[PDB]
Design a protein around this nucleic acid. Structure first.
Ligand SMILES: [Mg+2]
Ligand SMILES: [Mg+2]
Ligand SMILES: [Mg+2]
Ligand SMILES: [Mg+2]
Ligand SMILES: [Mg+2]
Ligand SMILES: [Mg+2]
Ligand SMILES: [Mg+2]
Ligand SMILES: [Mg+2]
Ligand SMILES: [Mg+2]
Ligand SMILES: [Mg+2]
Ligand SMILES: [Mg+2]
Ligand SMILES: [Zn+2]
Ligand SMILES: [Zn+2]
Lengths: 91, 104, 53, 206, 36, 100
RNA sequence: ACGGAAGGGCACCACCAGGAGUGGAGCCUGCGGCUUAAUUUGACCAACACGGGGAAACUCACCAGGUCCAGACACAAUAAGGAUUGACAGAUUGAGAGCUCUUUCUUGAUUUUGUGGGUGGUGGUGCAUGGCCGUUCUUAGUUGGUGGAGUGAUUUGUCUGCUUAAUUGCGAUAACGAACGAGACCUUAACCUACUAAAUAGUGGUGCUAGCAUUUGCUGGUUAUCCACUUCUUAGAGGGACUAUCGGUUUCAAGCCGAUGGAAGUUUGAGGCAAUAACAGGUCUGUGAUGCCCUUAGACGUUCUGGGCCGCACGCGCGCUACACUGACGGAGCCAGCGAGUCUAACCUUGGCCGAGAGGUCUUGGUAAUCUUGUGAAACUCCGUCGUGCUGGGGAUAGAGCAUUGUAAUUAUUGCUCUUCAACGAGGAAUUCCUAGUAAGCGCAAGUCAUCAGCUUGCGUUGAUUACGUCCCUGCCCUUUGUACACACC
């Protein structure tokens, strides 16, 4: 996808600040309920890096559930330039 | 002439005024392609304007589009009709038939 | 482009869908179920709908 | 919200949670959820055969599942609490047995061997009857259906609602889908709730 | 078929979020920047 | 002493009656004055649907029912032993609303 | 398995006796055909008001067109003097679309270009499948263990006879003992001057209190106006029926038939659930169920505009309205039950006002045994007009106007007013459903639903005639029997 850098950073920071992302399968919703970003943007940034790994997705009645993995925590630490003590919220 | 208004007054009557002398459907719709003049005037006189194409079959004939040639879409093959004062108050789609006559 | 990429979907069959399978046809809109008739048959016992008579 | 719509939506939410945990905690042996509503918080008691994988390291998995359910169902943090307690008897849960047999067929085990393993385990776990139906292209063919039964099995009347556990799973093999149906008739004698015998069972004292 | 002609190495208006990198384009009477 | 009404709604009649009887016994053992438990007619939320997932076969219909049962008991009680009698009822499946 | 073989039993998806019809008319609706750019498509007892399929847009799958990638990601061919993104205005376009161009600004390692690999698909395959439904089959049927018979397939058990709705039982007996089905069960509809309890149900009497009558009585309002009670209502726990009692008749019982009592005596009525084996039955167009195949950037993805699904020489199925006086029309009488309904918001709407109507407007109550709602339903009843005529039956077709829903009513969404006033004079051969609160007539709620019922799912109102049988027709069950059938008499 071709998404703004700041919007991708908003999604990335919510992901490695809460641990889980729940996005409705609606590729036209203007705003994500939790994140001030396009729902399409959230969904596709995850159909993105969840494919390299770093996350696990479950569909479950038109509602994607993404959960971080260990490689996810490491990669997002590197991405957001965070010190190696800020564990995800789920920890 | 329309219902109590001659052609001369019609040609000068603005859409808003004309609506008041029009049946229930059209005036309710008004209570709820302006390039036409660009072919009405930007064309040689004593002749007809160039056709202006549109998909809007639900456009009501007002006495502002009188004289213009409109290519109405009926799903394919824009059909050119000349807006005449008898068309007033009718939908654009009433003059571009959507189907082919069966002819068993 | 993005301006003309959605027409009104505020009503009619295209506004709503099954909350399970996102199908537009056969929807159950009673009591706010908003479930396809087939999905409702599949998970009627989970919701609390049972056959007695 | 009206009471009709409230209770209907509560049932719908229970079904949503049930399917979510069915899809998520399959490999962890999920066996069913229960939603208790307390004035301060809602509690969701998960029954999974493995109540350590659902928890996770220091509760990581259960906390992330709580986060997922909060974010999906718009719950203020702290107002919902998942507790993975236990499945008291694995062999009596049709859902657990169906999931186990699906896992066995997926990772490779003969249909008859896996089905009779499930049937034998259920019967030795105190059940008064078990039946496993495997339907589909057992070996690439006309898609037969094989039944493997032990004990007896009433089907049906009211006693099937009373004590019969049925579960249906789709196993996705490289050649189509196999359908697994597991039916367990638990012993009415050790019911510990509801009627303790069949309606036509008469016991006399002397 | 957006081609975006290469446009090899090379004023201002209101809405001060336009931060002095918003040079105008001149065909004729063109007072509108890229943002608008 | 404030007058409050407790409304109990549930699909499971046995536990709804367990809660209503716990409330009545708690009001008697705390020596309150209560208008008896009124049982408003159970709402049968029925829904009719076609059994087949397609359009083939004999047109066989299927009625599913959700019987919702409702109860209200209103009485007069002070704050501590009204909070305790609304916090004693945490039986699963019964929804309880206390209105002042 | 079949038989234009036999015996026994059984069924208004069979008949007899009948009722209501359908088939004939107009229209509604589905199917075929024809037509079309497309008229998307599945289905041919067990397809055809079926796909919950009442499609203006959406739905949508079809057609004429126009966008976007929502082509992840390991990888190499583009990037740190720009890989890329977007766009005012004008051409262009249906389009106020940066689609593309005129053309120069904006943004900046997110993409773009090719390989590999994914992703979506209402694209194909229901003869590759899961699941689910339908059907065989609404019948009473089905199966081990051990024993008996047979070389064996297999058989007995699972049966002569009575009995039952029943492979239900009496019983008989190379079987014995069991399992499923039936039944039992569960839901519901009947009753209960019995229990518990009710300004979310109701009843009496006190307050206040309009009318009539005036010796205290009739009917009334008093929704914070008191007290008592639960007959009506509600819903918990229970009771009640077990063919009870008495006759008759059964081989010998199982049972059956009468009468009495009873609220109820046909499994008390109606359902829900419902075995074993199957069908190349339907569904890949419910599914983020799914294998394989196909396609994947000029898309079969997705979205937008417009059209189509409804198109009409014609054939068919479900239906609505009728053909009239057992009626139509006008007044007046004024009686249900099942239900549904809005808090992030526009749902059910009382009442006031405006309007001939539809409808509009101002409020109100209701998240509901509370308000809509006593849903003041319709048929029906009474009193009148009509007067037997295509008539004041019928209301098709059509013209004009007024409203409502909707972004949008043209191919008329629907409602309303006036006008027009077709066929139809009870319907051939055929053919359907039905045995009691049933048929039929009658409307109402719900489902779909922004709007749109002539549909369906339920509900109540009025309420017959006929029969209480049979195996003639069409079928079903058991047994015997024949078979050159086993893809099983198509
Ligand atoms: Mg039964
Ligand atoms: Mg006859
Ligand atoms: Mg008729
Ligand atoms: Mg498509
Ligand atoms: Mg098939
Ligand atoms: Mg033997
Ligand atoms: Mg035999
Ligand atoms: Mg077939
Ligand atoms: Mg159609
Ligand atoms: Mg329909
Ligand atoms: Mg022959
Ligand atoms: Zn669905
Ligand atoms: Zn600018």
């Amino acid at each position: 996808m071709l998404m703004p850098k700041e919007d991708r950073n908003k999604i990335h920071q919510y992901l490695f600040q809460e641990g889980v992302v729940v996005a409705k399968k609606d590729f036209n919703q203007a705003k994500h309920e939790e994140i001030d970003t396009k729902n399409l943007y959230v969904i596709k940034a995850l159909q993105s890096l969840t494919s390299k790994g770093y996350v696990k997705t479950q569909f479950s009645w038109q509602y994607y559930y993404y959960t971080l993995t260990e490689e996810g925590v490491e990669y997002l630490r590197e991405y957001l330039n965070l010190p190696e003590h800020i564990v995800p919220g789920t920890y | 002439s329309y219902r109590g208004v001659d052609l001369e007054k019609l040609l000068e009557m603005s859409t808003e005024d004309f609506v008041k002398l029009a049946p229930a459907r059209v005036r309710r719709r008004f209570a709820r392609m302006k390039k036409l003049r660009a072919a009405k005037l930007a064309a040689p006189e004593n002749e007809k304007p160039a056709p202006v194409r549109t998909h809007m079959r639900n456009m009501i004939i007002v006495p502002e589009m009188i004289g213009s040639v409109v290519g109405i879409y009926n799903g394919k093959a824009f059909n050119q009709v000349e807006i005449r004062p008898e068309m007033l108050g009718h939908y654009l789609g009433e003059f571009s038939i959507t189907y082919t006559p069966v002819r068993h | 482009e993005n301006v003309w990429f959605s027409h009104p979907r505020r009503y009619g069959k295209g506004s709503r869908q099954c909350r399970v399978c996102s199908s537009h046809t056969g929807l159950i809109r009673k009591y706010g179920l908003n479930i396809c008739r087939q999905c409702f048959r599949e998970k009627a016992n989970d919701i609390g709908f049972n056959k007695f008579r | 919200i009206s009471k009709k719509r409230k209770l209907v939506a509560d049932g719908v939410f229970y079904a949503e949670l049930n399917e979510f945990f069915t899809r998520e905690l399959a490999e962890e042996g999920y066996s069913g959820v229960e939603v208790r509503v307390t004035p301060t918080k809602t509690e969701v008691i998960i029954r999974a055969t493995r109540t350590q994988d659902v928890l996770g390291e220091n509760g990581r998995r259960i906390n992330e599942l709580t986060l997922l359910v909060q974010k999906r169902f718009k719950y203020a943090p702290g107002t919902i609490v998942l507790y993975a307690e236990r499945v008291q008897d694995r062999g009596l849960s049709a859902v657990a047995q169906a999931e186990s047999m699906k896992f066995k067929l997926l990772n490779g085990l003969a249909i008859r061997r896996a089905a009779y393993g499930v049937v034998r385990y259920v019967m030795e776990s105190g059940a008064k009857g078990c039946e496993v139906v495997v339907s589909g292209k057992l070996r690439a063919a006309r898609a037969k259906a094989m039944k493997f039964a032990d004990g007896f099995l009433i089907h049906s009347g009211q006693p099937v609602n009373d004590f019969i556990d049925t579960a249906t799973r789709h196993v996705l093999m490289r050649q189509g889908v196999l359908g697994i149906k597991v039916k367990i008739m638990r012993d009415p004698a050790k019911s510990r709730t509801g009627p303790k015998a069949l309606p036509d069972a008469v016991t006399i004292i002397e | 078929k957006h081609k975006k002609v290469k446009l090899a190495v090379l004023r201002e208006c209101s809405n001060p979020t336009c931060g002095a990198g918003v040079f105008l384009a001149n065909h004729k009477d063109r007072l509108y920047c890229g943002k608008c | 002493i404030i007058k409050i009404r407790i409304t109990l709604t549930s699909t499971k009649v046995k536990q709804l009656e367990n809660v209503s009887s716990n409330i009545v016994k708690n009001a008697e053992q705390h020596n309150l004055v209560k208008k008896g438990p009124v049982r408003l007619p159970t709402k049968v939320l029925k829904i009719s649907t076609r059994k087949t997932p397609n359009g083939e076969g004999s047109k066989t219909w299927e009625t599913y029912e959700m019987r919702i049962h409702k109860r209200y008991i209103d009485l007069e009680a002070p704050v501590q032993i009204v909070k305790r009698i609304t916090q004693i009822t945490i039986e699963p499946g019964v929804d309880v609303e206390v209105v002042v």
